[PDB]
Amino acid sequence: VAHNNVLPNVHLHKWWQRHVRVNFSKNIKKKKRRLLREKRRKANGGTPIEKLHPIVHCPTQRYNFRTRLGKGFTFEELKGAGLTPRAAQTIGICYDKRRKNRSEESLTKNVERLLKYKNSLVMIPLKKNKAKKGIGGIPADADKNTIKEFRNKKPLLSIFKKEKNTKPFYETIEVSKIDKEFLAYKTLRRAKLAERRKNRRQQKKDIKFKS
Amino acid sequence: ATRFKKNRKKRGHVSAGHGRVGKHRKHPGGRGKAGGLHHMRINFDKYHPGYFGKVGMRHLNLLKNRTYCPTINVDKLWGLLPEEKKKEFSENKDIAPVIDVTRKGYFKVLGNGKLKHNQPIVVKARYFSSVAEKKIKAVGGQCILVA
Amino acid sequence: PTKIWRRWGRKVNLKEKRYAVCSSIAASGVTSLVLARGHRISHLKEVPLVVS
Amino acid sequence: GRKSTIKPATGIAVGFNSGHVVTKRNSKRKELIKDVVREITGFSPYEKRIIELIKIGTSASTKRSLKYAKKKLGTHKRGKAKREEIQKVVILQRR
Amino acid sequence: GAYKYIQEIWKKKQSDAMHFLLRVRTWEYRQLPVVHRVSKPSRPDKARRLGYKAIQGFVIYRVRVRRGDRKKRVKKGIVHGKPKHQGVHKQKSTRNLKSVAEGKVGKSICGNLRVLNSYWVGQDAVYKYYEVILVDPNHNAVRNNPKINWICNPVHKHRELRGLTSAGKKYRGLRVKGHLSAKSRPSIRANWKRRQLIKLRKCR
RNA sequence: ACGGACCAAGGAGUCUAGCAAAUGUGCAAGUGUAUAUGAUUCUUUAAACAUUUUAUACGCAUAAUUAAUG
RNA sequence: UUUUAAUUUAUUCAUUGGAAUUUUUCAUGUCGAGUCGUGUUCUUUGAGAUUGGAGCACUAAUACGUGUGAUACAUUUCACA
RNA sequence: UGAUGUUAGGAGGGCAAAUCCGCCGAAUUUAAGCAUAUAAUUAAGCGGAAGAAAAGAAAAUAACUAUGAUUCCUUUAGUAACGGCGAGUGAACAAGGACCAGCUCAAACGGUUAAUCCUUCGUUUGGUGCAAACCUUUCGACGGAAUUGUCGUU
Ligand SMILES: [Mg+2]
Ligand SMILES: [Mg+2]
Ligand SMILES: [Mg+2]
Ligand SMILES: [Mg+2]
Ligand SMILES: [Mg+2]
Ligand SMILES: [Mg+2]
Ligand SMILES: [Mg+2]
Ligand SMILES: [Mg+2]
Ligand SMILES: [Mg+2]
Ligand SMILES: [Mg+2]
Ligand SMILES: [Mg+2]
Ligand SMILES: [Mg+2]
Ligand SMILES: [Mg+2]
Ligand SMILES: [Mg+2]
Ligand SMILES: [Mg+2]
Ligand SMILES: [Mg+2]
Ligand SMILES: [Mg+2]
Ligand SMILES: [Mg+2]
Ligand SMILES: [Mg+2]
Ligand SMILES: [Mg+2]
Ligand SMILES: [Mg+2]
Ligand SMILES: [Mg+2]
Ligand SMILES: [Mg+2]
Ligand SMILES: [Mg+2]
Ligand SMILES: [Mg+2]
């Protein structure tokens, strides 16, 4: 090496030519994929090809304020809407047997999502022109007039999408409500200076309870 | 483009620009970072002083999501508001804004700059620095801690 | 020997593509420029040339 | 750090019990088989040795028993559990 | 039931009764051929835990394997290479002895059949003894049974030479998960291949 | 001192990765629509067009310094 | 020609066996062994008082148990499986 | 219980390899020399499959207001770490997408009655063929396997 440059670093010391991959068909493939998932719809004959997923928070202090879709409702969320895991699968509803509900807010949020979904669909009888009640929490079948007059409306695929945040980032207050005698830095530092012994006292409490 | 390459200018000359006496041989000083500390020492020393040796403690499994923390100075604190909304808080003296910087992606409020005199403001955040918190208290505001 | 991993294409800034399209439509409305591209429009009435 | 299941969190980012303030939400066949197997099988040799050392009945004997069980099984833990089990057996035999 | 008592008894192996029984078994296994058939499982309870069923197409065989390490294959023990590669006399194989026992009966002697599992029945200073379960994929008793007829499809031919039995799963690194086995799936070579790859856009 | 009996055709600083300096272009405290998806895109088109009906994907920049708790 | 979506009629009668949830009653059973693990020797990994595998010696517990939480120990709390 | 049987009915063997699965296993080269290191868990050698193969329904992460079988694309990142700490080497979690699926045995329970399975020979229906041929469909008998454990429940 001879000049004022950065010191070299490249990882090209094995037989690197055997495995190189140039992408010539990234748009051909998306055309193919679009046509396949469009062919599925014409075979489902009116029912959608999407499935309902819950709303969950993201796990870290880096992301815990925003939400996304999860892979399936819990057992306790399903019973809040009067459904069974086995019955719910036969509708486009997903089941997760290992997520939990550590708070009330998530429980009510997903129960409301389930109830909104269950309230906006018409059931087609198994044998035609033979309407019967439901089972396991499935709504009762529809009559041929409603079925005829709902095949011309546009299906709502917006229900499957994740919720949008609308929390504002500023607000207004009255000056007379301002607290003057507060000290945030001192609080933040006294809280750290005290953690070790509070942990110790909690462990002693745990030992006492165990007997 | 091969049209504008420097080698096309030397097409009639013998040595192609590399000299009669010292030719263009292949690797006449080593390969890669070979000779440093022996005969490339001066280049290393005057362009990259602290290169050799080790210092400090090891951290065996880092997990960078635990200490992510973007910052914002008090300079840029009134600029988050739109100009028309910035305007009415000047005339009226009875009302102050309440700003939540964690809705904008900031975590720790830091204290460089100058706030407008006698123009109160209330700020929410996870962390504050001492100077920033004092400067907010001086113009008649308050700091609020969230999580 | 020629290779398939020669960089065949380019990626262009979106704003520059839009700029070029806009500045190209504007050149379509000047009579002298259309004449200087080789179009035989001596008998035309207006160069923007809208039709029903 | 630690948290308390009762007494909800405080909205501070650091310290004990920190975080956002969401609402928190809360065989006799075995012994019969064991007795039959005990009739059939008996005691392993290292178990016999441990019983002997426990029977001697001093503090040096208990320390040597712990070391021996630890050597045979590995793991301080496993050896400690084995010593406890043999102590219970020998106590029961004396009644 | 009955099987629970056998399972508890076989857990000792150092009681007087089990020691006597194991001595008597291990003597007789020495006089018989290296690979021989038995008529019934000698440990029915341990065989049920693996896939064994009492149906027409299930059989048992017995195998005998030699213990220790294998000397590296250079003539006169002379290596022509660098001192890091001059080792011989303590080279250790990737595969178990159990996998080798399964392959001794699976490759040619019973190419009719398919290998399912095996279990330990004894050991000695020179040999280790196993028993291998085989299923016949052409008998209609297994072929009509909806629970066990995955075995009669050609994608399951010679499971003991591709690493697909339990002993194969052990030495391939697929018995542990997570941060201790991060680079073993879907296979060691395929995981290595994915990481060597250079992917390269058209427009760039 | 070495190569050259003669003539015709062929014959040697290139390609990819990564960094920098110089210069041209666009926007500017921001900038770059990644992988995907959409469209009354579908010889050409493997191109071109679009972006999810007080708006948190990611990179570089907007803040440094310390082995480190910070 | 291939197959797959809508739309067009099922009426009367006759058993037998299954299933989901709800109201109450009584029962806490089972859970993969020469395996897991530890010592030692050689390989392999980014893995560091040892990441996975293998040979030899020793050889467990019973769900309140067992295993993981990236520095070797002892006495403990907690979470996850 | 083993040998025996040109007894009746069946299976394996060889070819081909671009992509896939298991084992075995170098040196050239780089370090401006060279022995650990690198080349490389690569080339050559020996075995085994499919239109894909392998992986796969937690003895998993995290430390949060928590997520949730496998695979692959964008990024994390030439980063945490390894190294004659030299030359050189080098992953994982969270985030955004493609696709989207779950189940069985073993072990509990069933004894006024193994409920289970297979071979061989019979019969009983409707459709499709010019023909060849094929599909669907219950009910018997004799013989054998199995309590050293088939089937049902969960
Ligand atoms: Mg010159
Ligand atoms: Mg020259
Ligand atoms: Mg050699
Ligand atoms: Mg080897
Ligand atoms: Mg000369
Ligand atoms: Mg001459
Ligand atoms: Mg420039
Ligand atoms: Mg970077
Ligand atoms: Mg278990
Ligand atoms: Mg190595
Ligand atoms: Mg962790
Ligand atoms: Mg043959
Ligand atoms: Mg073959
Ligand atoms: Mg050299
Ligand atoms: Mg050299
Ligand atoms: Mg040399
Ligand atoms: Mg090869
Ligand atoms: Mg084949
Ligand atoms: Mg497969
Ligand atoms: Mg598999
Ligand atoms: Mg990745
Ligand atoms: Mg090492
Ligand atoms: Mg390597
Ligand atoms: Mg993901
Ligand atoms: Mg059973």
UniProtKB/TrEMBL annotation, chain A:
Keywords: Ribonucleoprotein, Ribosomal protein. This is 60S ribosomal protein L13. Residues 204-211 have a biased composition (Basic and acidic residues). The keyword Ribonucleoprotein applies. Residues 194-211 are annotated as: Disordered. One of its GO terms (molecular function) is RNA binding. InterPro entries: Ribosomal_eL13, Ribosomal_eL13_CS. Belongs to the eukaryotic ribosomal protein eL13 family. It comes from the Eukaryota.
UniProtKB/TrEMBL annotation, chain B:
Residues 71-144 form the Large ribosomal subunit protein uL15/eL18 domain. InterPro entries: Ribosomal_uL15, Ribosomal_uL15/eL18, Ribosomal_uL15/eL18_sf, Ribosomal_uL15_CS. Keywords: Ribonucleoprotein, Ribosomal protein. Residues 1-37 are annotated as: Disordered. GO terms for biological process: translation. Residues 1-13, 20-37 have a biased composition (Basic residues). One of its GO terms (molecular function) is structural constituent of ribosome. It comes from the Eukaryota. Pfam families: Ribosomal_L27A. The keyword Ribosomal protein applies. GO terms for cellular component: cytosolic large ribosomal subunit; large ribosomal subunit. Belongs to the universal ribosomal protein uL15 family. PANTHER family: 60S RIBOSOMAL PROTEIN L27A, LARGE RIBOSOMAL SUBUNIT PROTEIN UL15. This is 60S ribosomal protein L27a, putative. It comes from Plasmodium falciparum (isolate 3D7).
From TrEMBL, chain C:
Coiled coil: none annotated. It comes from the Eukaryota. Belongs to the universal ribosomal protein uL4 family. This is Large ribosomal subunit protein uL4. The lineage of its organism: Eukaryota, Sar, Alveolata, Apicomplexa, Aconoidasida. The chain holds residues 104 to 155 of 411 of the full protein.
Automatic annotation (TrEMBL), chain D:
One of its GO terms (biological process) is translation. GO terms for molecular function: structural constituent of ribosome. GO terms for cellular component: cytosolic large ribosomal subunit. Keywords: Ribonucleoprotein, Ribosomal protein. InterPro entries: Ribosomal_eL36 (IPR000509), Ribosomal_eL36_sf (IPR038097). Signal peptide: none annotated. It holds the Pfam family Ribosomal_L36e. Belongs to the eukaryotic ribosomal protein eL36 family. PANTHER family: 60S RIBOSOMAL PROTEIN L36. This is 60S ribosomal protein L36. It comes from Plasmodium falciparum (isolate 3D7).
